[PDB]
Amino acid sequence: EHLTIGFKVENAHDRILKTIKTHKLKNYIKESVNFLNSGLTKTNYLGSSNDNIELVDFQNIMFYGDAEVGDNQQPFTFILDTGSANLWVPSVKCTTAGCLTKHLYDSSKSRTYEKDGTKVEMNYVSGTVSGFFSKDLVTVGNLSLPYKFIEVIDTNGFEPTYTASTFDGILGLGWKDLSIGSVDPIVVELKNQNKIENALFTFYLPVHDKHTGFLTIGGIEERFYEGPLTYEKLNHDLYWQITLDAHVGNIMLEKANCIVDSGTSAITVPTDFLNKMLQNLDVIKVPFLPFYVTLCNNSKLPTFEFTSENGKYTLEPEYYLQHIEDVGPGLCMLNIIGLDFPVPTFILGDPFMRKYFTVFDYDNHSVGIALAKKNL
Length: 376
Known about the structure:
Helices cover 13% and strands 40% of the residues.
């Protein structure tokens, strides 16, 4: 009854393997492991200010390439983004080098296009994205609706990952940001136009296929989860952010903010917490390569524990460890990085969501967490 669409996923693990085999680093890492755990070091290398992990390197990219905008248009590949509120489409008027690569939306070829022209300009540290609002018939799966999206005329802002990747535009799955426009998120707008039952969407990430995920819009398909579904109300009005008592074994954090984000390939930890976490854990950071390594046989590998008033959630090693056994006997990288926010926060990315079926409820302003069903 509810619309469920399938999408492809590109993660850090994918991008890293590319880098390793592109430059034949099959034995730089292998030797770097056998050394930085020898005890010679007297302290394992977890990174430096010089050699660190950037969140952009662990950017989880979900491809949905069968959506439409307008009548006579090229197809557009969008990426899901729970941190954005709007739909962003590269205009045919965009003259940047990144746009020349992508499929561009020509409003003059669309029979159902209504001009808005409300300018949207953002100033990112990575550059500048510029454009204006446009209304047209947008189609996702078996759902269509007149929607105000953004025609981008300048893609320099996020171009680093833009020309690198293969997607054309962005599909917002976050909360309305009035600094950009008064337009509602496409999932909300579908509810506004009574095309879906409720203004919510769910993420089912198949634990055994990290290249695949499923987005369901409008309702909660019971089959996706087992056990009790727990709701955690949001502590923010712009993010899918909740408060959980977060601890790993003996080290503990209280009332920490936690963001659920499919667009992150990892569990991000506060840097200071991550350090006390990984002391003498036979886990090292490969120098000048953006990932931590350990032999997957590791006995002392910790389990994340997130506690709230209504539920408790655990992330065992099984979920943040991805086998790089192809690069050498025993090894596996960790989908865990260090990231500092003004307030101590965790990003509950892909690994958390591989274990837990996640519900994003606009109407109830909360995140619903349930143990995903592994069997179909």
